[PDB]
Design a protein around this ligand. Structure first.
Ligand SMILES: Nc1ncnc2c1ncn2[C@@H]1O[C@H](COP(=O)(O)OP(=O)(O)OC[C@H]2O[C@H](O)[C@H](O)[C@@H]2O)[C@@H](O)[C@H]1O
Ligand SMILES: Nc1ncnc2c1ncn2[C@@H]1O[C@H](COP(=O)(O)OP(=O)(O)OC[C@H]2O[C@H](O)[C@H](O)[C@@H]2O)[C@@H](O)[C@H]1O
Ligand SMILES: Nc1ncnc2c1ncn2[C@@H]1O[C@H](COP(=O)(O)OP(=O)(O)OC[C@H]2O[C@H](O)[C@H](O)[C@@H]2O)[C@@H](O)[C@H]1O
Ligand SMILES: Nc1ncnc2c1ncn2[C@@H]1O[C@H](COP(=O)(O)OP(=O)(O)OC[C@H]2O[C@H](O)[C@H](O)[C@@H]2O)[C@@H](O)[C@H]1O
Lengths: 400, 80, 400, 390, 401, 51
């Protein structure tokens, strides 16, 4: 099921349309949490089930006393998990400030259980998280293809591809460190890693005549970011983080420090932490306001009001193009036609009903998954589709 | 400056060559409108040239190219 | 009193350095809240004094129950107002979710009373705020000199000067209109005046003039309001006074979103503000150009964003800054004794650099706004030879 | 009925002729009081008729004691309501100077009445005059197309169009504001707007977005003079709150040398300075090479404009197109002895002997709406309401 | 007593600045009613004083009944003639309109006796106005020096000087006709002289390849121009004008009916048929809108609204320089600081307080007169040297001690 | 659409410059008048009338 302005078109026309959109001035990709489920991840509604199956005692006090979550949302598994941690942190900060001793322990006990659940679903490798060369496994085969296809079809004197994501796992970094490409994420250093917002305007060049780099914007943080005793933000490696604070979170049962971690959107009230979050949104808004931009959306659930508001306002420009994947079009169309369903369904159906040649919507279940998304993109002619290096490497290793 | 003014003429081209009973004319391009009012833009028409004492009458035969340039060929029939 | 590159400098070399720095391609200024004290403005200490004089019971409620302000800090007038509004908003947001009403009302009162005092300090003329021809008075004498000197040192082919500010008052606009010069601030129209981000790329031209500049208000203005339709409008002073300012000042009405201003630490709390991002994008685009000079006056170095941006601009070897800070010597001492405030550390760090591109000026009352304007030079109309005339006096030294 | 020097033309030839003229160097338009009648406007005859049957208790004094109005003109509805106000102002000034209270109190009622009738017909939206986005309504639909296909036709490197107007209402400002272009009228500033004549020589450019010019020949409702000897400008809402509201909804009061409409206080050296500049600019523009002029809604009842237009035809590069509806009705009266100066002037241009004047007549075929269609040709709401819904 | 940008500068710097301003592309001068005082002229205060002591009953009728002139201002001599003329015309208009007869005839005597005093003060020589070779006298020396200095400083390939004036007298043409220079003023013919706007763009040329000339603009008309019924302006000579229409005005009484065109009124836009006045001001406004332009103002009392508006709006061009002469600057400064002062005194003080180096004001009483202004102008240097060895001689000159 | 333009006129003959067989008819837009032509043999054509 493919729609372009309310009408249907076949697969060949869609592929031709995709081919023409990949030779514009600006090209970007925005990914969600559904694109990491083929590597070992879980969706947002598979975490609430685990939380309400493993901790059935805090759920009553989280509804009847503090009114932090509705019964209807909990019974249908439609709770925004990352929108609750910020409120919990605010409550804990207020209780600590006004010295209500009995109220501190209760909020220190629910955060310890929420982090313990959200962290375990983002490792993607279990205890093989502190090792090396994690990108050589077969689970990350399509991330490499996406990265290679994005880079290898840009002409000289053109911009570099940009990648936005709502995840906080380390899949893309592992994929990129295997191909040999360097990604810019706003940090510099080895012994003291620090955040510099001005390094997003830099590029490489050759002193003799290369153009192998890209930009990665993480909108909800990362597992490897934390705020030390000073007022600065540092980044470390996977092994150091595991030996420092992840092992205790997963294993120990009475561990909680405070305003230390920067995931997911937790400690926004501090003015040295929210400054990191604001820059990513500002630069996302700046990107899609350019004359010849094309954006691909996959894995997103359309449950965020701010991103929807930003995207809708950017369509009043006659040279902006969007492609969206949503493998549930029929189940939303019926529910909206009869009585009207949820907010995400209403937003997606209203966007589908528009009579523009700029918006294209693709559905069909497994036909609109992440794996199928890659093959719709073109393949370069000069890319070597053979195996010549591995044989020589094995022959060298065989010697002596 | 003062009241006296002299020139009042509306031309469509000027003579650029003579080759033994064969006249070439280069057409003006800066004229927004050739209205004075008669129109001569087609073979078979009659045009006149002023030589101070007499007026020479000719007839158009051909038009061609080579903001491009346009050319006209004409032949004479008499004078007034 | 004057340091360049970490070493002391004299006045005669300083004046010559300042003269040669006004001949570059780009020149700009940044003015703070201390530059409007010669016209009738107030600083943040006076706001706290007025608040503790006019409202004696809310202060007791703040100090006794909620413990947001310590008694000894209040006694010495060493409390930060921007860091109290954020905490008050946090308390109100927490109290509104759990449905507590009595605690909710007391914080609405505090926020309204605190905004009311901030508004009163930005009129500069009391009840005469609504009249006409306010730039003819003797108070606005040095603003006109600044504008004239900046606009007269411009050779053909160069770009117009830029002025940045963090105030809410109409001082520059009053001074410029009385002079006859037009300033661009992003708005257009008379009967319905609206914001247009692409209006910053316009310039004058002669059909067969050359006197204009640009103004960027980073923290909003007192004559702006948002009509909740994602549009911003601008009105005159008399219209604003008749519409909403009078009710706030006199009728003690409960505060609402009558006018958009940004007092506080975390400016990213207001998500739907799209003027702040554009202003700071334009500010950041300015300091990345070669052959740039910047003069700073009246700034207390208490904003995280601004001094985070300034630090990253010193990695370009074509950027020069001059900083005016009166109380340099008192800030030097408190650092070697263990450390002062966060504002007193940044200036000492900047002073102790090893590049010949940072200049710091101190000396108490001789680093004021009035002294700053006098150091700027007047242009030379007709140059001279200086080879024949200067040797006339060479005779005198051998005959006297 | 379309004439050109006494001949006749069809629709297609005229439609090609207007297209040929629009590609010249300089292009201009002159409007009148008839171009604003489609949005809620009026004409001089209508306002005189309304004045006659609302204040008949003092119409005798204007004919008997002071001799300002003619009986024949009053009965035939052919008075000029622009000179009467200036004469009344002169009379009031002289009476005030001589310290004659009895005659001074008499003239403060005639002006209070005349301004009351004049101001009502110019609001164009009743009590909605003080609101915002008034140019988004369907009444101001054809005013926008004129600007849209006057700006679009011009090639790069060409000059900017000019618009001359005799009205004093905000009909061309609201439309321009809603379109998204800027008009230069000779004022600058926000908190104190002042008149600078030399702003008419400015233009925009891009560092790496269009404009036009607007000249008002009789003033505007938003212009006034304060105690300081300077001319200011305000917005619609501020004007309504300051002085316009009381003029309509109060019995009797008068200010003095305050307002600058319509051509009222010319005996003061500060107010005539702004009337003179528009006339001199019009005269300078009319005498340029390769220019065109389109006239619509003009009754040809002004003596000086006729002298200016006639004297400008001595050059070969000046083209004029006129839209006069009652053409044959004027020729019929010309055949007989009687007539009027306007009719005599207009019929004379019909009997010319060169291909420069083009007079267009008929019934509804020559109005403002018909003129717009002769010029060549040059989904947001869904998104706006979708965003508002969220 | 010399200011530039609000600061103070001395005499040597002023002279060096003045020398450089005369080397620019465009140079001009504007003269007022005080520049002809050394020749025999007089100002408006003298006109009012003469009027009050020859027509007493008219002054009484003006003060008592119509209340146009106050009793105190008459004694202290602060009356303004132009406003009085405008008010008298305004009264006559309504008198005509309401068909009142006695007052209409009454005002004509005042309006005719007021022009007579203006005409008598513009002759400068009394009965010898109808005679030749008036420029040979010693009273016109500085005008000739001014013209010579202005003409001599131009380089080949540059434009000619322009002169503007607001006087009706002939003090500047008599001086030029004694040197042989030709002045262009927009007239042609001998037996019938007429006005043509198109001949302001004419220049001399030598057939074998008369090189000195200039221009003159008279903003408020002239004593020799007159308009016929055909709505055209004609020019005559001094003798013919004296013997035909300005001998009955003076010796005989009440005989002025639009005989010669002049503009002594405050509002000059009232006349809607006069095109010479509109032609001169367009040329004036076009001149100060060019790059590299210098202007000198002398004798102007700063009491005209139109000129004041033109001057102020021309200072937004970064290539325009002016120099203004004003004797009584100290009194104006003192009187404005008390919150009062006349309208004319505010304009000059406003200019003096600007922060631009393109405005200079010269005061000092007798040091800002016409003769001093002419003496401040420089003489050209005919044969300049590279000044690389002459400066060596200057250095060597005096060091024997 | 179009098939070419005109480069010259020779008496009563028309020359068309290409960017469809003898006997076909073509038309030329001349503003108020449309001219119809007949193909005979760049291609050559004659004139028949106007519409
Ligand atoms: N294998 C798959 N391949 C592709 N898509 C899939 C797959 N499996 C499921 N999906 C689709 O993947 C989607 C699951 O979406 P979720 O992970 O719940 O939502 P988010 O990642 O946007 O939540 C985070 C944001 O939303 C919050 O409000 C905050 O604002 C955050 O910014 C559905 O469409 C599935 O059908
Ligand atoms: N006459 C004077 N001239 C110049 N500087 C002066 C003068 N008098 C005092 N100062 C100095 O001017 C400075 C005034 O200190 P503050 O009022 O805190 O400066 P700010 O504008 O950065 O702070 C206002 C907040 O507004 C925004 O929200 C930002 O977040 C700001 O934090 C001191 O150094 C005085 O010594
Ligand atoms: N719907 C219409 N569409 C077009 N033209 C119309 C229409 N209705 C009437 N007309 C024509 O438009 C004419 C309008 O007549 P008036 O309003 O008196 O003419 P003005 O605006 O020039 O008069 C005011 C100015 O002229 C004087 O100088 C005054 O002093 C003012 O300056 C009608 O006669 C019709 O021919
Ligand atoms: N010898 C002198 N040399 C130079 N300036 C002098 C001399 N004597 C006096 N002054 C100065 O000359 C200045 C002007 O004297 P006024 O007669 O008031 O000039 P105005 O303002 O009427 O302007 C003249 C015309 O302006 C109008 O438009 C009318 O057409 C007038 O005729 C005074 O400041 C004297 O100090």
């Amino acid at each position: 099921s493919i729609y372009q302005g309310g009408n249907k078109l076949n697969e060949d026309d869609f592929r031709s349309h995709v081919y023409s959109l990949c030779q514009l001035d600006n090209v970007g990709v925005l990914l969600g949490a559904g694109a990491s489920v083929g590597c070992g991840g879980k969706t947002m509604k598979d975490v609430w089930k685990s939380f309400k199956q493993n901790y059935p005692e805090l759920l009553g006090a989280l509804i009847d006393k503090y009114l932090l979550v509705s019964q209807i949302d909990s019974d249908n598994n439609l709770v925004n998990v990352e929108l609750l941690i910020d409120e919990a942190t605010k409550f804990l900060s207020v209780a600590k400030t006004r010295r209500c001793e009995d109220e501190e322990e209760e909020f220190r006990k629910i955060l310890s259980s929420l982090y313990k659940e959200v962290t375990k679903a983002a490792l993607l490798t279990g205890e093989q998280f502190r090792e090396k060369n994690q990108g050589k496994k077969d689970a990350f085969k399509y991330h490499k293809e996406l990265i290679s296809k994005l880079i290898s079809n840009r002409q000289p004197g053109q911009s570099a591809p940009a990648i936005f994501t709502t995840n906080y796992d380390l899949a893309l970094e592992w994929a990129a460190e295997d191909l040999g490409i360097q990604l810019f994420n706003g940090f510099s250093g080895l012994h003291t890693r620090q955040f510099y917002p001005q390094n997003f305007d830099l590029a490489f060049r050759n002193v003799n005549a290369g153009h192998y780099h890209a930009y990665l914007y993480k909108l909800h943080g990362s597992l490897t970011w934390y705020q030390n005793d000073s007022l600065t933000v540092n980044e470390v490696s996977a092994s150091q983080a595991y030996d420092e604070y992840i092992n205790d979170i997963i294993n120990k049962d009475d561990f909680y420090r405070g305003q230390h971690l920067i995931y997911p959107g937790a400690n926004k009230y501090s003015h040295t932490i929210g400054f990191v979050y604001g820059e990513m949104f500002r630069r996302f808004g700046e990107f899609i306001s350019k004359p010849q931009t094309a954006l691909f959306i996959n894995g997103f659930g359309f449950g965020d009001y701010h991103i929807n508001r930003i995207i809708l306002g950017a369509l009043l420009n006659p040279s902006f193009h969007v492609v969206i994947y949503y493998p549930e079009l029929k189940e939303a169309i019926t529910k909206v036609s009869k009585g009207g369903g949820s907010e995400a369904e209403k937003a997606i159906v209203t966007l589908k009903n528009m009579a523009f040649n700029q918006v294209t919507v693709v559905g069909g279940g497994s036909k609109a998954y992440f794996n199928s998304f890659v093959e719709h993109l073109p393949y370069p002619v000069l890319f070597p589709r053979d195996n010549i290096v591995d044989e020589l490497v094995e022959a060298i290793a065989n010697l002596s | 400056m003062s009241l006296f003014k002299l020139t009042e003429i509306s031309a469509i081209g000027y003579v650029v060559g003579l080759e033994g009973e064969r006249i070439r004319i280069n057409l003006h391009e800066g004229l927004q409108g050739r209205l004075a009012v008669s129109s001569v833009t087609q073979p078979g028409d009659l045009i006149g040239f002023d030589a101070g004492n007499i007026l020479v009458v000719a007839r158009v035969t051909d038009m061609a190219f080579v903001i491009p340039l346009r050319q006209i060929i004409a032949y004479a029939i008499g004078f007034v």
